[PDB]
Amino acid sequence: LYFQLEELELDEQQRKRLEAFLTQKQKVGELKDDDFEKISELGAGNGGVVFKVSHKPSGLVMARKLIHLEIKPAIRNQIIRELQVLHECNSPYIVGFYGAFYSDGEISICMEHMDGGSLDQVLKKAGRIPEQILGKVSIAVIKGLTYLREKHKIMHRDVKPSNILVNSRGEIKLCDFGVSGQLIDSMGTRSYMSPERLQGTHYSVQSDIWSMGLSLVEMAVGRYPIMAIFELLDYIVNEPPPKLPSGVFSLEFQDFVNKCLIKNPAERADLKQLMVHAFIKRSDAEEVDFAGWLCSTIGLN
Numbered sequence: 001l002y003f004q005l006e007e008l009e010l011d012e013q014q015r016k017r018l019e020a021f022l023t024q025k026q027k028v029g030e031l032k033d034d035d036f037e038k039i040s041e042l043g044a045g046n047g048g049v050v051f052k053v054s055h056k057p058s059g060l061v062m063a064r065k066l067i068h069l070e071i072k073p074a075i076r077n078q079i080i081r082e083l084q085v086l087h088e089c090n091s092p093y094i095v096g097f098y099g100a101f102y103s104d105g106e107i108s109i110c111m112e113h114m115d116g117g118s119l120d121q122v123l124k125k126a127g128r129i130p131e132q133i134l135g136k137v138s139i140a141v142i143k144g145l146t147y148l149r150e151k152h153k154i155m156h157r158d159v160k161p162s163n164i165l166v167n168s169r170g171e172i173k174l175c176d177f178g179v180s181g182q183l184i185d186s187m188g189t190r191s192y193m194s195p196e197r198l199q200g201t202h203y204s205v206q207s208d209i210w211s212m213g214l215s216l217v218e219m220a221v222g223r224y225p226i227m228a229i230f231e232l233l234d235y236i237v238n239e240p241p242p243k244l245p246s247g248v249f250s251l252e253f254q255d256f257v258n259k260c261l262i263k264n265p266a267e268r269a270d271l272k273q274l275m276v277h278a279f280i281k282r283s284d285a286e287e288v289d290f291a292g293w294l295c296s297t298i299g300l301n
């Protein structure tokens with residue numbers, strides 16, 4: 001293989017893992033319904049359901065997300081066409097993609113199976129995720145958001161613990177970002193939307209920053225930090241943002257989440273500021289055995 005991964009920084013471990021995934025992907029060509037065998041259900045959200053499957057031609061285990069959309073065949077063909085751009089999203093912080101196709105009123109998004117599941121699933125088992133672990137998660141999210149913005153000019157639009165995936169090798173990656181404008185158009189009482197997004201305002205990277213801030217507060221405290229549908233959104237829009245409890249969390253992490261949750265999107269931190277925040281600088285220097293922690297608290301082999 002003739003890798004063109006020079007644009008990425010990549011340490012040796014990151015390079016070896018990304019090349020190993022892209023090498024396995026070479027076993028995968030055109031994707032068809034008949035070529036899959038369902039193993040189990042990974043989870044289900046609002047948009048669809050995701051299955052752990054076996055791709056029979058390649059022998060690869062994959063995560064297959066199915067989204068029910070039996071609409072005008074021309075508009076769904078544009079969705080599928082736009083989803084092919086996921087073939088160009090190669091990053092240590094973005095879940096690997098195999099292909100997207102349509103069959104029997106369902107669009108399938110086939111991706112790399114992340115054996116540690118999502119952070120909302122690990123949150124259930126862990127109770128609360130330690131600050132040191134959230135440090136590495138925060139790095140992964142900022143770096144993934146940066147890659148999507150700089151390289152493909154795409155905003156995530158769906159940052160939350162269920163869209164942050166982990167594995168036994170200690171990798172933290174984003175999935176379910178807004179790569180297809182038509183999929184967004186053609187498409188809970190726990191909301192991660194920024195106060196300006198809930199009011200109407202055009203999507204900005206600042207809206208993903210808020211979403212990340214709220215997700216970190218929930219993972220650190222073990223509960224959604226804000227019930228009745230309108231009551232919940234009225235609190236996000238009209239009441240002060242939540243804060244981390246003092247004493248239990250360092251001043252750097254409290255300042256980091258505070259900067260993400262600033263109601264004013266102009267005052268709110270941007271990715272460049274967050275990458276050089278003291279919480280990130282501190283977390284980057286720390287030696288945190290993320291894989292050891294993940295495997296021991298969720299019982300992964």
Ligand SMILES: Nc1ncnc2c1ncn2[C@@H]1O[C@H](COP(=O)(O)OP(=O)(O)NP(=O)(O)O)[C@@H](O)[C@H]1O
Nearest residue numbers: 042043044045047048050063112113114118162176
């Ligand atoms: N690649 C994957 N590998 C392993 N588990 C996955 C993968 N993709 C998704 N999952 C799991 O499947 C669950 C359901 O995913 P999903 O249907 O996207 O619901 P959601 O994340 O809760 N909502 P949304 O992202 O807004 O559509 C997730 O919460 C993950 O636990």
Ligand SMILES: O=C1N=CCc2nc(-c3ccc(I)cc3)cn21
Nearest residue numbers: 047095097109175176177178179
């Ligand atoms: O925008 C969206 N709306 C609804 C569902 C959905 N799934 C994705 C997606 C899935 C895997 C990967 I990797 C990247 C993007 C985007 N998306």
Ligand SMILES: [Mg+2]
Nearest residue numbers: 045162163176
């Ligand atoms: Mg999801």
